[PDB]
Design a protein around this nucleic acid. Structure first.
Ligand SMILES: [Mg+2]
Lengths: 33, 126, 292, 128, 110
RNA sequence: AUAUACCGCCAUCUUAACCCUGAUGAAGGCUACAAAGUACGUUAGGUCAAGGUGUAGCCCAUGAGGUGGCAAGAAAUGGGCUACAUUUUCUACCCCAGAAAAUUUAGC
C-alpha cells in the first residue's frame, strides 16, 4: 500500500455492513418513519 | 380442504409488528453506535449477531424470549430469559462457560443475567 | 376473570408497593400521592415510547381491572333497588326523578351530555331512542321555571364549551414622563414584527424606525395600509404613532405595522368601535405563511 | 443490617499534593440519547449530584436531530446540555467519574472542558 | 422458590439492594409495576417475565437517598474554587488564556 | 456470464348459546306513546455505479499485437437543452431618475 502510495505520489448502505434486524428491533435506534 | 373453504401463542415481541419498535416495543440491543457522531455501529451489529447465534446455540430450548444486549463503557451485559426446565447446575456451568468465552473473544468484561420463568409468557394468540 | 379475593390481594400489594416507593424516593409515605407515584415511576423506569399507555405504570388496582361488576342483591337475594327488575335501574330511576320534578314544577355556551358519556355516568348501556327520551325530558325541565335545585340537576347533565370571541384585550393606557397618555402593542405579518406606540393626542405624525412614514414607505399601497386603521374610525390627524418594525419585506412590514397600530388604537376608541374594527378584519393576525 | 454492622470502614486515601490545581471556567456536558425519558432521568441525577457537591449547574436542551434513510427508517438523537461553571480540577474529575460511571446504556457523552491558564513567561515581553 | 421481595421490610435500606447499575429483577424489585399495551378488555402485563421492563435502562441504583449518600462521601475528593474569582470579569483578568479540550464517552471495546 | 447464484436494496401481488311462537309440522321472532327477543409467503422482477459471499466460462484465445476501413441517408411523429423585449434592457438606487431599443401542466 505505502509503496504504491509513494510511487503514485511521485507520478447498499454500508454504515452497518438489515431489514430483518431493523424490523425485529435488533438495531439500536433504528425505527420505521 | 376446499378452495373457498379457506376463504399460535405469541409473546409481546412476537405480537407487535415492526412499526411499533419505538411506540410499543423497544430495542433489544442498547448502545451508542447509532447515535449521531458515534462510530463502529457496524462492528456492534456484527457483535450482536454473533452473540445471538452463540447464545441460541449454547442454551438450546432454554431461552423463553429474545436476548437484551446492553453496553455501558466496555461492559457487555446479556440479559436473557430462560425456562426452568434445565437443572440449575447446568445453568451455572453454561453461565461460567459463556461468560469466559465471550470475555476472551471480545476482549471485554462480559457478564450474564439469566432470568428463569416457569413457561413462555404468552401475550396473545395470532 | 378476576375474583374478589384476587382484587383484594392486588389492593394490599399496591399499598405495600406504595409504601416501598415512598421509602425509595425518600418521601413521607403518609402524604405520598398518586401523582408522586407517576413521577417516581417515570424517573426510576424511564421510557420514551410514544404510546402513553405503553410506559411502565403503577395504578391503584381498581383503576386497572374492570370493577363495574357491582352486585345488585344481597345474601337473601333481595335486590337493593326497587327498579332492579327493569334491568336499567339507573336510567329508569333517573327518568322517574325527572318526571317527579316536572310534576312538582307543573303544580307550582353549553352542550348536552353525549350518549356514551351518559352511559359512563349511569354505568349501563342504553339505546339511542331512550337517550332521546331522556334529553327531551331534560329540555322540558329547562323550558319550565326550573329552580336552583333543578338548575344544578340540569347542569349535572350539561357539559361546558367556552366561547370567548368579541373580546379584544384592550391594552392599558400608560403615561410617559412628559405626562402624555399612550398605548403600546405588537403585530406580526409573515416574518415581519412590528411594535407601535399610539399617543392619545397628536397631529397625525407616524414615525417608522425614526423615519417619516412617507420616506420609509415609498409605495402608495403601504401608505394606504397604514391609513386604513385610523381612517376606518374617523380619526385621521388626531394621534401620533412611533413604531419599530423589523424583518420581512415591504408589504409584510406594512401589514405588521397596521395590525400593531390597530391593536394599540383599540385603547382610545369606544367598545362599539373596537367591535367594528374586529369585524372589518383589522384586529386579526393573518396566519397565511409560506408552506414547505 | 439490624445488628451486624461493619465496625469501621477503610476510607480511600486522598492525598493533598503540593502541585497547584487546574481551574476550569466552564464544563459543558452534552449527553445524547435515543430516548427523552432516559435523558430526563439522567438530567435529574446529574443536577442533584451537582447540587450535593456544591457545583453550579445550568441545564438546557439542544434541538434534536433526525436522520432518515431508505421502507423508510429513522433515527432520533436527542440532546441534554449540562453546563457547570467555576469548578476546580479535582471537583471536575470526581464529578465526571461519578456521572460517567452512572451513564445509562445507549447514552453517549461529550465533555468540553475550558481550562484557565496564565500567559507564558516567554510572551510577557518582546525579545531584545 | 418464592421471590425475596416478600422478605423486604417497608423501611429497608434500598441502596443496599441495588448498589450499582443492574438489570431489572422482578424478584428483587418490590414494586407492582406493569408495562405493556393492554389487549382488548385486558391489563398491562405483570413484571415477572416482562421483557419490556427488562429493556428499560432503570435508575433503581440512583435514588435521591442513594445520590445524596454518595455525594456526602465524595466530598472528600473535592477542592474549592478560589473565592477571589467571583465572576467572569476577574476570570478574563487574571487568566487571559482559555483552553478548550473535549473528551468523548461511547460504549465499546476501544 | 450468472442476483435466470445467494445476501443486500427497491418494487409487484396474496394474507355459538339461551328464551318464546306455530296445538311442540316443515317453520318463525318487529312496532320507542314499543306488541319476545337477549347475548409472512410471491416474482424466469429490476439493481454489479457509491455493497458484499460464491459459482461457472475461454486459456494457439472470450488473451496480446499489427495493416486498412468504419465517421450513414431520409421522412413523420415522441421527448429534452438554449434565446425568445417594451409590463423589456443598462446604470444610480432599492421603486418620484437618466439613457437604449392541439393536447398538456397546474388550480382548491
Ligand atoms: Mg432478476
Amino acid at each position: 500500500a505505502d509503496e504504491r502510495l509513494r510511487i503514485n505520489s511521485l507520478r447498499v448502505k454500508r454504515r452497518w455492513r438489515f431489514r430483518h434486524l431493523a424490523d425485529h428491533g435488533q438495531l439500536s435506534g433504528i425505527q420505521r418513519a | 380442504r376446499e378452495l373457498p373453504c379457506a376463504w399460535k401463542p405469541v409473546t409481546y415481541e412476537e405480537a407487535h409488528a415492526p412499526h411499533y419498535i419505538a411506540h410499543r416495543k423497544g430495542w433489544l440491543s442498547l448502545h451508542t453506535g447509532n447515535l449521531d457522531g458515534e462510530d463502529h455501529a457496524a462492528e456492534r451489529t456484527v457483535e450482536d449477531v454473533f452473540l445471538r447465534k452463540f447464545m441460541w446455540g449454547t442454551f438450546p430450548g432454554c431461552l423463553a424470549d429474545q436476548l437484551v444486549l446492553k453496553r455501558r463503557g466496555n461492559q457487555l451485559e446479556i440479559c436473557a430469559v430462560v425456562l426452568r426446565q434445565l437443572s440449575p447446575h447446568k445453568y451455572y456451568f453454561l453461565v461460567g462457560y459463556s461468560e469466559t468465552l465471550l470475555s476472551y473473544f471480545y476482549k471485554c468484561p462480559v457478564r450474564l443475567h439469566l432470568q428463569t420463568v416457569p413457561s413462555k409468557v404468552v401475550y396473545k394468540y395470532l | 376473570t378476576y375474583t374478589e379475593d384476587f382484587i383484594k390481594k392486588q389492593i394490599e400489594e399496591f399499598n405495600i408497593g406504595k409504601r416501598h416507593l415512598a421509602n425509595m424516593m425518600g418521601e413521607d409515605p403518609e402524604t405520598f400521592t398518586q401523582e408522586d407515584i407517576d413521577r417516581a415511576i417515570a424517573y426510576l423506569f424511564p421510557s420514551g415510547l410514544f404510546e402513553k399507555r405503553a410506559r411502565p405504570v403503577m395504578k391503584h388496582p381498581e383503576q386497572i381491572f374492570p370493577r363495574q361488576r357491582a352486585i345488585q342483591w344481597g345474601e337473601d337475594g333481595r335486590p337493593f333497588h326497587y327498579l332492579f327488575y327493569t334491568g336499567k335501574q339507573s336510567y329508569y330511576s333517573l327518568m322517574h326523578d325527572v318526571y317527579g320534578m316536572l310534576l312538582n314544577l307543573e303544580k307550582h355556551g353549553s352542550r348536552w351530555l353525549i350518549k356514551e358519556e351518559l352511559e359512563e355516568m349511569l354505568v349501563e348501556k342504553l339505546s339511542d331512542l331512550d337517550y332521546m327520551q331522556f334529553i327531551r325530558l331534560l329540555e322540558k325541565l329547562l323550558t319550565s321555571q326550573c329552580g336552583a335545585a333543578e338548575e344544578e340537576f340540569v347542569q349535572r347533565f350539561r357539559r361546558s364549551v367556552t366561547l370567548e370571541s368579541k373580546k379584544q384585550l384592550i391594552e392599558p393606557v400608560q403615561y410617559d414622563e412628559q405626562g402624555m397618555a399612550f398605548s403600546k402593542s405588537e403585530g406580526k405579518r409573515k416574518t415581519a414584527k412590528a411594535e407601535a406606540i399610539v399617543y392619545k393626542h397628536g397631529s397625525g405624525r407616524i414615525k417608522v424606525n425614526g423615519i417619516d412614514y412617507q420616506l420609509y414607505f415609498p409605495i402608495t399601497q403601504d401608505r394606504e395600509q397604514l391609513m386604513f386603521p385610523f381612517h376606518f374610525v374617523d380619526r385621521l390627524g388626531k394621534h401620533d404613532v412611533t413604531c419599530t418594525v423589523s424583518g420581512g419585506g415591504r408589504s409584510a412590514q406594512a401589514g405588521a405595522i397596521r395590525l400593531a397600530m390597530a391593536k394599540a388604537l383599540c385603547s382610545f376608541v369606544t367598545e362599539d368601535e373596537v367591535e367594528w374594527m374586529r369585524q372589518a378584519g383589522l384586529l386579526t393576525t393573518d396566519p397565511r405563511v409560506r408552506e414547505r | 443490617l439490624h445488628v451486624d454492622v461493619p465496625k469501621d470502614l477503610t476510607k480511600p486515601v486522598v492525598t493533598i499534593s503540593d502541585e497547584p490545581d487546574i481551574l476550569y471556567k466552564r464544563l459543558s456536558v452534552l449527553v445524547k440519547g435515543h430516548d427523552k425519558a432516559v435523558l430526563d432521568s439522567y438530567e435529574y441525577f446529574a443536577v442533584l449530584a451537582a447540587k450535593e457537591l456544591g457545583i453550579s449547574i445550568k441545564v438546557h436542551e439542544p434541538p434534536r436531530k433526525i436522520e432518515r434513510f431508505t421502507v423508510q427508517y429513522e433515527m432520533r438523537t436527542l440532546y441534554r446540555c449540562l453546563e457547570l461553571e467555576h469548578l476546580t480540577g479535582s471537583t471536575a474529575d470526581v464529578y465526571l467519574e461519578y456521572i460517567q460511571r452512572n451513564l445509562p446504556e445507549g447514552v453517549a457523552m461529550e465533555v468540553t472542558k475550558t481550562q484557565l491558564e496564565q500567559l507564558p513567561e516567554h510572551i510577557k515581553e518582546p525579545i531584545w | 422458590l418464592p421471590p425475596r421481595t416478600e422478605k423486604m421490610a417497608v423501611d429497608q435500606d434500598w441502596p443496599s439492594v441495588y448498589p450499582v447499575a443492574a438489570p431489572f429483577k422482578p424478584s428483587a424489585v418490590p414494586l407492582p409495576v406493569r408495562m405493556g399495551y393492554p389487549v382488548k378488555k385486558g391489563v398491562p402485563m405483570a413484571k415477572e417475565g416482562n421483557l419490556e421492563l427488562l429493556k428499560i435502562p432503570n435508575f433503581l441504583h440512583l435514588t435521591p437517598v442513594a445520590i445524596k449518600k454518595h455525594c456526602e462521601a465524595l466530598k472528600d475528593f473535592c477542592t474549592e474554587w478560589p473565592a477571589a474569582l467571583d465572576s467572569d470579569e476577574k476570570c478574563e483578568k487574571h487568566f487571559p488564556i482559555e483552553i478548550d479540550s473535549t473528551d468523548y464517552v461511547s460504549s465499546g471495546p476501544s
